[model samples]
Target chain A: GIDPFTFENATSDAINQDMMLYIERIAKIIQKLPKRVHINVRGFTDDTPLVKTRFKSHYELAANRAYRVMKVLIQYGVNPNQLSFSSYGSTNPIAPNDSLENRMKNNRVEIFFSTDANDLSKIHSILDNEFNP
Target chain B: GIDPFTFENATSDAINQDMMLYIERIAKIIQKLPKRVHINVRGFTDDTPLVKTRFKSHYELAANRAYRVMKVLIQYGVNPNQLSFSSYGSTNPIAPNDSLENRMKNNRVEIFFSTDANDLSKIHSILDNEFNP
Candidate 1:
């Protein structure tokens, strides 16, 4: 199984150079993983009052950040159909916004894996062989 | 078609009595809705310091509130299998933590409806005649 993305800080014109390299690494690994494991990249932001930014709210700020990161992953050869993105605005912060350091902790992009495909049919198959036979 | 749970203020032991009245009304509405629409009652909390509460953190405080509400829903004849619960701790606040009113806004339970069943297979049938013929 491939580990997920950890793109940090949304307050820039360019993503961290390191994240670009990480995305390339991630895409390479993800391509080999079972397609059934859907990957979603989600973005979040600190609760800082918006100013000197193009986005009026953290929702759009986080959305753009998530969009660019996922776009890069697709650019690096991850399947476009398999990847999706979401945003938490400033609501899903990892830490309280009381301190500058903690506020910085909230400004990040994260990834989660989920699947709609059911895994329960195998249980029924196992149950059938034992119970019926 | 039944609207959702909105139990508020996890800080108190007894839920809003008005909420109990609302829940009974909601249960009546829910029993008639399509069972395939899975309902999840989720709990949330404010970002206040957790010293006075018996719950070590807001997550537990929130979870108890959600469990009690969902449990009551079951008692009122909603199917136990169809209802589920989750918690967001203090993370997914609907408003900022800057003021008492906003913090009050965060401490509540909300419900969402989703389904594991696929709806897309119907589209394939729609396309079959036009595309194949």
Candidate 2:
């Protein structure tokens, strides 16, 4: 899910054209869901230290990135009220921060959906039908 | 709980003698809890922008404050395995970042305890017995 839109080596969190096209598809899927559905866009960053950049730490950087995704989702028709963002800084890595490739893998955005109305799998089923291989 | 240990004027998050004394009591309370218990020292910061500080944003500042609290807890005898830290940046403000007094309230730390072994009230009872008036 991240390859086409992976953030390159701690750059500004600008959503490129490739990411816009990818997020648009998910936005359309979310639009059809129940109004109770809420989406939390969580952001993570690799352990690379910051020096001259506008961001001083991975937490600020990740929060900015997560907000970008949340804004893009709203731009693409996801309800703004149902969206929120969180940051994990350099913590909770899926892969070890040992190499460039692994570090890139660590820098990612995860979207979690939930609803107080019913079973969560219902929302997953719809997504699976659309994107599952 | 914050007044005596309050951070003043966006300065260094140094725990003064008052805070050092306050945290020790809580540290002792936690030490007697079940080994399964875990404590998360969460930090927060006011909305003041970082212009020249070593921190670039409230997220970094808040995180540093949280780590300091966690370190002190560990130093005062709480188990390292039972501790972790989180930051909310300028988010989750307990008080509005208005006047200096309110901003100081916003700049604070919170400790959360949990355990999967049983009902959480057990730990609270132990803490209440030691500290509650």
Best by DockQ: 2
- Against the native complex, each candidate's DockQ, computed on alpha carbons, is 0.01, 0.03
Model 1 scores a TM of 0.42
Q: Which ranges of candidate 2 are over 4 A from the true structure?
A: A1-133, B1-5, B117-119
The best candidate by TM-score is: 2
- lDDT of candidate 1 over B43-129, digit per residue (tens): 788888877666766766676666667767867877543565676779988889898777777887786766444623433343354
Q: What lDDT score goes with residue A24 in model 2?
A: 89
Q: Mind giving the per-residue lDDT tens digits that candidate 2 earns over A5-73? A: 357665456778877887887788788787668777878888887877867568767767776776688
Docking class of 2: incorrect
The iRMS of model 1 comes to: 14.8
